[PDB]
RNA sequence: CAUCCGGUCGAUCCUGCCGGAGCGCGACGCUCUCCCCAAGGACGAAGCCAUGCAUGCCCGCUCACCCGGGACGCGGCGGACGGCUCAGGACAACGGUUGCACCCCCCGCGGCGGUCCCUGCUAGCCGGACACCGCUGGCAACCCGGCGCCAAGACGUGCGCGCACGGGCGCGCGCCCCGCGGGCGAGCAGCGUGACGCAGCGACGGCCCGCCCGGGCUUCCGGGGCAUCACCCGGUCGGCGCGGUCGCGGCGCGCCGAGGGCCCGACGCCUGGCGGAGAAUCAGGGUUCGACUCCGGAGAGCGGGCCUGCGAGACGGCCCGCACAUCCAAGGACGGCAGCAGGCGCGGAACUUGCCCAAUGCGCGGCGCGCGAGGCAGCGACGGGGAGCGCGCGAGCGAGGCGGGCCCACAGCCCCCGCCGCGCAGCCGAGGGCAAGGUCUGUGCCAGCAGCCGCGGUAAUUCCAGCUCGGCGAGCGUCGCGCGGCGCUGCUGCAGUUGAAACGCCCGUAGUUGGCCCCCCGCCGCCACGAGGAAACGGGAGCGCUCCAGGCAGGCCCGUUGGCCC
RNA sequence: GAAGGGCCGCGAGCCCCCGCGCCUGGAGGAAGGAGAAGUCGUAACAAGGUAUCCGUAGGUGAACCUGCGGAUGGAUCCUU
RNA sequence: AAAAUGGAGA
């Protein structure tokens, strides 16, 4: 997307009936700027902001690229 | 009212949400204003520059771009300003159709008259490109004020490599 | 049973419970939603209506006598269902079309005891209780 | 919002889990004669009050002593039970509630005190005497049979002036 | 829905107003004013119930209007008069004046007050906000906002009032450990001093308060109402912030039940 | 709060489900001497409404063939509050967590309260101009015809301090990070400069900013079923401008780039789908329901649009489309009860075309009125909580009659007093589970009984009656329901060699699961553990209504209460 | 500056083709189920008289029979 | 070699 990245957070939900968890995930969109270009597999913080657009409400700040391929592992950071 | 609600728009995933209720007055929308600029009053006197104040939530009063032709410009370099009636709308940039009806738009590049700004030639060569525009009585500028919401025709003068970028289009393209 | 047990397996167990819940005849009875539409009674204790042709259903075994019942069309769903009469010789009171309320046989669907093929049981005729008509407690 | 309808309702009468059991059935009639209960709903009403008094103690026993929820509630449990007298004030024990007697709740009932103190000398006589307004607690006449008096004020039970104690001058039909 | 509303049922009453759930078709909502909705206990109960000076709310209606109570010189006919902590309810006829302090049980209770105490009422301040074309102003916890405040003070300063012109009595400044009196959560009528500031570049500042009982507890600084630069400086409730516990409450009533 | 037992047979030991047995809610039926507190057209009809009422209050301005009581209107404010029903609505409504430096607001409340004037000026007070009325118009009504005067705490013109001061502009900090103060967590506000410009109010000068307040978005975590719905969206999805709104925004309108979201189930479809606080029944663990108090959301036959206002797309506002009405004199008009009664319709079923502002709150208003909100009574086996029909050998009462007292907007009721006192019961069974006659009468596998398992084929413990008697009881039973039973839905905690059940076989991608192992670091998850999280209700202080059920009162009183856990 | 007209901005509804989705009416076919005593044979259960039975084809009044590969739940746990 | 029934319901 032009100047836009879709970041996926993962939430582990405790269900009571069975104390095992579900790895439900959410993909949220923000606004990156060419000042901090992003690689695939990076840790990207999104700041609660003014409602930018129909889906846009967040904005990227810190980018930490991980080496090789980061895959998923459902890691919430 | 012609509402502006999220429910009316489709969800990002393509869901068409049925609206929970009917449309709301605080979400109301209004008539887009088509501004009227007079090249010359000449023989006809039926049209004059009139501005509209409208009812709003909270009693707030909104001046509107009913009929505005007189225009004001402050030289960024000088910080002094002069007020007259601008020639017309020249570079709406959104649409070239808007230009034909002289519908004013916030910060749309226009054609600027120099009836009180011809005084610039007295200072020695200030903004020689502006000096060449001022004597001619035709200049480029963006009326940077909100016409529909606040009924304002005050605007900045175009100076800077930004004026040159627009000028390259304004001259043959 | 294999069983899938892990700290992150609330998915297998959630789907399995939902799918394998509807296996019981009783569970499906109340959870398919067919039973409210399918039952002649719309899931109610009693239903008013008008009486139609009377009926003499042969019993099975051991019971070996005809048990007089009346088939009545319930007004609400416009459907005709038979209702077993109450105590000894209580059918003579019921003849032509008359206001009849019908109630469950306890089982709620299965035919009661050993009288075959009857799902419902009449409880009233006209405006007086049919178990009072039998005792002459309340009768025309 | 229909403000006068707002209220609460209670279920003192709780029936047991299997009704026709010979031991439970026999004890019912046996108890009914012992304390002179007119209805069998009341014995179950007693069972419900007894259970609440039994659970509070079991949960309290499983808490360690002086645990604030335990300490305040324990003293509370003793205070109400000691007032009743079913728990001897001397016992003074949160655990002492366990092993409780249904007969003791029945003993607390004022109808019982009248028979014991020979005020009427019979449970059948006692209910009839209370029906005819003949026993007053601290002088407050009560015609409902189960006044239920705390032991702390058991010594204040009294008879009635209308026709039992020092006749006021109203001997039922005999007066006229 | 639609526009703003002005009614309250007798369950929506904040459970700290301790107005009875029974004996109420609809709760007394307080009209907006110097004091916000949750905080002010409607003045109908202050005269009709606590004082028991009015048999009914109609009796509160009969005399409140004719200058019977004057905090900063005002009575009003409304029994919804807005009030709060350190507000000097003043009655000339009762031959007494009083300040409503938060009782430990979470209901503001009137403490009979001396005339020197009648002279001063206290409202907290937040951060100076420019008002009147940049002519300075100070945001306040109760609605008394004023122009031209003390120029050097910057944030969270408690302020007292003379009750007439009521110019700021004192610009108390926190020195950390300064005698503080937060009134929120379980801090109702509780006295102490502050300890740790956790603004944390985040919302809601956690300030720990060491107390005379010995408790140090962090809380929103929003409910701060400092009592004195040092010492209470204004008489505190009969508890004095000591805060009683349920076990004693049974006994205090138990002796009282026997005593009556 | 950790449970059974009747049933496959000749018997046994099973699995397995059927049935009782417990418990709540409504019907229904059989029935009531009580007394007290009480739900009440939620249930494929958010179907239609006849008949009344349901937001009204003060005349600044009164000159009205009056009086000190003032009509009327102009105005002022309220009818955006409430009451009701959950139709619609499935990343919505909804609970809690963020922020609004993307934002409006009336009441009240604390500050401010300079307002150039071009013009006209009376600036110690200027206008002309409407109702009420006066007079005379129509119609079948509805509906409101002209004219004539005439006032405002009505409406309008306008005086007043160019550091006028309305917005909105145009324009002016920085100097690689960070601190300073009117500042925040955040360079945000404000000021200055330049151009406009006409907001104040003001003809009894109140504009402005705060605080509260009720909104308006918004961030996270939650927020029905169906895969005999697998690929879906096409303003769809990101930017780039712009319009529009209180406002951010695809919200719209242009311009582009191809995006979005998905087996962790997208999109679609269905729902006798309002969500939650809650409710039911249970050891734990659950399961089930949430329409009714309260809390938020919606909606007033149905779709749209619009006004008035500070806020409504209001519906006892309007105007149109669509149905269905009503008057209708044929020319017209004029509705809206999912407000309270009350009908019609409908069903198994669901209260007075009552009284009514005294309270309880809310409107207008210091010298009181309204509110079919509510209050009150009526009805009412929804349901509860507590009595009786004797005890005894005498004499005792409580259901009542009459009067008193008391009580109550008014009456009632418990109560309090006396003469008197008219004590009075049901509905289920009796072979087993499941308690209680192989009594005595009809009786012929006939009638019938019969939850269940089973009885009646001519000598019934099983029916049909009268005996008796067991249970429960002014409430007993019959049904449909939810929970427990049922570890028969299984996470705890089930089976699959033969009862019901391992794919015929192997690879394989997501999905699930990966041995030891690096003490100390940082994130995960994770517990301890706070802050701040509305109640009602429930757990639960204290408290004797004639005892509780109840309620939060009470008395010389913890500042007496109503603690505390939610 | 009204009654109007116009250019239009919204906008219910309509109409005309469809793409769905829910509900229903049918002459008649074609099944399933139930009740002490109907018929025609008698398949299987004893090696039930041809041991069964499964898959698959072929016939067949009616169950059934037959062909070919299996399994014993077989009547064989057992001779180089 | 053939070799088929055995009403219902205690």
From TrEMBL, chain A:
GO biological process: translation
Superkingdom of origin: Eukaryota
Entry's Gene Ontology cellular component terms: cytosolic small ribosomal subunit
Keywords: Ribonucleoprotein, Ribosomal protein
Keyword Ribonucleoprotein assigned: yes
A single MF term (Gene Ontology): structural constituent of ribosome
Family label: Belongs to the universal ribosomal protein uS17 family.
Entry protein name: Ribosomal protein S11
UniProt organism field: Giardia intestinalis (strain ATCC 50803 / WB clone C6) (Giardia lamblia)
Span covered, complete protein: 78 to 154 of 154
TrEMBL record, chain B:
Xref: InterPro entries: Ribosomal_eS8, Ribosomal_Se8/biogenesis_NSA2
GO molecular function: structural constituent of ribosome
GO cellular component assignments: cytosolic small ribosomal subunit
Gene3D superfamilies: 3.10.290.70
Family named by the database record: Belongs to the eukaryotic ribosomal protein eS8 family.
Official protein name in the record: 40S ribosomal protein S8
GO biological process, one term: translation
Sorted UniProt keywords: Ribonucleoprotein, Ribosomal protein
Lineage: Eukaryota, Metamonada, Diplomonadida, Hexamitidae, Giardiinae
Presence of the UniProt keyword Ribonucleoprotein in the record: yes
From TrEMBL, chain D:
One GO location term (cellular component): cytosolic small ribosomal subunit
Species per Swiss-Prot/TrEMBL record: Giardia intestinalis (strain ATCC 50803 / WB clone C6)
InterPro entries: Ribosomal_uS4, Ribosomal_uS4_euk/arc, Ribosomal_uS4_N, S4_RNA-bd, S4_RNA-bd_sf
CDD domains xrefs: S4
Region (Disordered): 1-19
Keyword vocabulary terms for this entry: Ribonucleoprotein, Ribosomal protein, RNA-binding, rRNA-binding
Record flagged with keyword Glycosyltransferase: no
Entries under PROSITE patterns matching the protein: S4
Family per similarity comment: Belongs to the universal ribosomal protein uS4 family.
Basic residues biased stretches: 1-9
Protein name: Ribosomal protein S9
GO molecular function: rRNA binding; structural constituent of ribosome
Single Gene Ontology BP annotation: translation
Superkingdom, taxonomy of origin: Eukaryota
From TrEMBL, chain E:
Cell membrane in keyword set: no
MF-aspect GO terms: RNA binding; rRNA binding; structural constituent of ribosome
Keywords: Ribonucleoprotein, Ribosomal protein, RNA-binding, rRNA-binding
A Pfam family per the record: 40S_S4_C
GO biological process: translation
Listed GO CC annotations: cytosolic small ribosomal subunit
Record-linked CDD domains: KOW_RPS4
SMART domains xrefs: KOW
Family: Belongs to the eukaryotic ribosomal protein eS4 family.
Protein name listed in UniProt: 40S ribosomal protein S4
Organism in which the protein naturally occurs: Giardia intestinalis (strain ATCC 50803 / WB clone C6)
